[PDB]
Amino acid sequence: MKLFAQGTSLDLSHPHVMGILNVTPNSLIDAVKHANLMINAGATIIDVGGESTRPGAAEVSVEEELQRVIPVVEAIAQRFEVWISVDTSKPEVIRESAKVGAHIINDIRSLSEPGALEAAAETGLPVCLMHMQGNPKTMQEAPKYDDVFAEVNRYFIEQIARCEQAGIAKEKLLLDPGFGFGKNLSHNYSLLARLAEFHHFNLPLLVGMSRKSMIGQLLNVGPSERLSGSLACAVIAAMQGAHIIRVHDVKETVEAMRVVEATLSAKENKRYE
Amino acid sequence: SMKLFAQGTSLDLSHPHVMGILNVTNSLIDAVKHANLMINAGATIIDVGGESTRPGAAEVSVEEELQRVIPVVEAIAQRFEVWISVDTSKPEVIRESAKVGAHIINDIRSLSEPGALEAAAETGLPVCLMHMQPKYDDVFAEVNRYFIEQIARCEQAGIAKEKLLLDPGFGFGKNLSHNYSLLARLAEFHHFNLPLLVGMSRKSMIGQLLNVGPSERLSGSLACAVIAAMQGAHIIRVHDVKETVEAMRVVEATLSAKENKRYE
Ligand SMILES: Nc1nc2[nH]c(SCC(=O)O)nc2c(=O)[nH]1
Ligand SMILES: Nc1nc2[nH]c(SCC(=O)O)nc2c(=O)[nH]1
């Protein structure tokens, strides 16, 4: 399995580590310094995001998001060979990010915003479809599912069809069950335990559990104390054949992924279920 | 449902246990301080030996080994509720360790010394059967055959199956690829219906893979522990207790949400 964008390809025969580069508040110099460190630590994708996914923040204007995101995507694309994912829901940011070299559109809202689907289709870039119950402002009030796995799985079926209808072929899609997005602790572990069953779509799986409450609430530790839990999550998902792991702690995750790959390559069937 | 019994208590193996490595090196005060730190960090078993009992460490007389081991085992058994595994190959140390409260006999020489098997049998304690010998035809098959053989040998000596734990012996006469073959197939050793114990912490199977020194192997050691625990390994022997306990909690929460309670 492979993805193609901007004249290069990403080989998904082993797990990739995607480093988080938050550009919400010198800003450009600092972002590039951080990118450089993450690449050096072995990140093969850098996820650039300029709108907080937090509960009460006003949505950032299109002009402010462009100012935070585009110069950063641009500076990374012209210095490094790394893949760049852009964490946006706005069509204009999608368009302008593609123009300066972004490889993956990583929308937490799965292109639900007006125009976003058409803009993503126009760029021809890979698109990540992430499950979220409701919207970021209220999704954590009262998450509820009768069957969280089936509900997430159904969402993927629907969203795939929506993308295909807009001209975005299956081969461009990645799926992400959206850890922490309208999910309590037990919902998150039900999804993680069954993650391998999402392979039936024959699409790349991306996960992001790094430093999230599904670790914090389980261990009763603060946000700076979650590395060991974050590594355990990453390993659990990668052992089940997750293709991309989105993280804060790149060096440590890359090391863990090398251990996973050595294990998977000694296994006859290449996956745990 | 699987449990071990020793010294009037039991160990509930329905979730993964972290076994902390304790050096025996005043020595008593320090050993008890370290045991305390590991317990606080969430270790439920302390393995008494560490650097003093690694392969290649200097051999000592029976009297010297008794003088270093027995007071440590004794002091831990008197102060804490934790299980104690004792690293020894000598029958006298086996016997005297049992008398002062040890729960598990951990002999990396597999009770090969004269009288060791009979002494382990006499104690009635749990015994860890660890594979050691690198060339193999089929490393798994050899390690599996070794378990079959050592189980029979123990049973012949009067040590019932219910007392045994199996450990494939990562790093013990094994190159990098042998170690990963065993780790990838670890769940297949559940056919014996015995507890599985593993020790990969800071070993060359991480160092050689990552090209890092002994103090830089925590992330790799955690990955190893998680991989084994996801396959239903019952006990994980480690240097880095707090971090491993946290990783095991994550594994437990995942296994509990799974209808199968195991990865294969
Ligand atoms: N694709 C994807 N994108 C994300 N962006 C964030 S932001 C919240 C945080 O890092 O805590 N989470 C995710 C995720 O789980 N998947
Ligand atoms: N049961 C058991 N006991 C051990 N003692 C050592 S000493 C080598 C080291 O810690 O690097 N390893 C092991 C192991 O793998 N299993």
In short:
The structure is a homodimer. Chain A is an alpha/beta fold and 273 residues long.
Summary tags:
homodimer; 273 residues; alpha/beta; TIM Barrel; 8-stranded parallel β-sheet; 9 helices; 16% strand; globular; binds the ligand Nc1nc2[nH]c(SCC(=O)O)nc2c(=O)[nH]1; DHP_synth_dom (chain B)
Textual characterization of the structure:
The structure is a homodimer. Chain A is an alpha/beta fold and about 270 residues long. Chain A has one domain: TIM Barrel. Chain A is built from 9 helices and 10 strands. In chain A, the strands form 2 sheets. Chain A has an 8-stranded parallel β-sheet. Chain A is globular and about 45 Å long. The two termini of chain A are about 20 Å apart. At the A-B interface, helix 6, helix 7, helix 8 and helix 9 of A face helix 6, helix 7, helix 8 and helix 9 of B. The complex binds ligand 7PJ (2 copies). One copy of the ligand Nc1nc2[nH]c(SCC(=O)O)nc2c(=O)[nH]1 binds next to strand 7 of chain B.
Separation of termini of chain A? 19 Å
Number of helices of chain A: 9
Strand arrangement in the largest pleated sheet of chain A: 8-7-6-5-4-3-10-9
CATH class of chain A: Alpha Beta
- Which ligands appear in the coordinates? ligand 7PJ
CATH superfamily of chain A: Dihydropteroate synthase-like
Radius of gyration of chain A: 17 Å
Oligomer: homodimer
Query: Into which percentage range does the β-strand content of chain A fall?
Result: 15-25%
Largest beta-sheet characterization of chain A: 8 strands, parallel
CATH architecture of chain A: Alpha-Beta Barrel
Secondary-structure element pattern of chain A, one letter each: EEEHEHEHEHEHEHEHHEH
Care to count the β-strands of chain A? 10
Helix percentage of chain A: 40-55%
Count of domains of chain A = 1
The name CATH uses for the topology of chain A is: TIM Barrel
Category from helices, strands and their pairing of chain A = alpha/beta
Greatest interface by residues involved: A-B, 38 and 37 residues
Overall body shape of chain A: globular
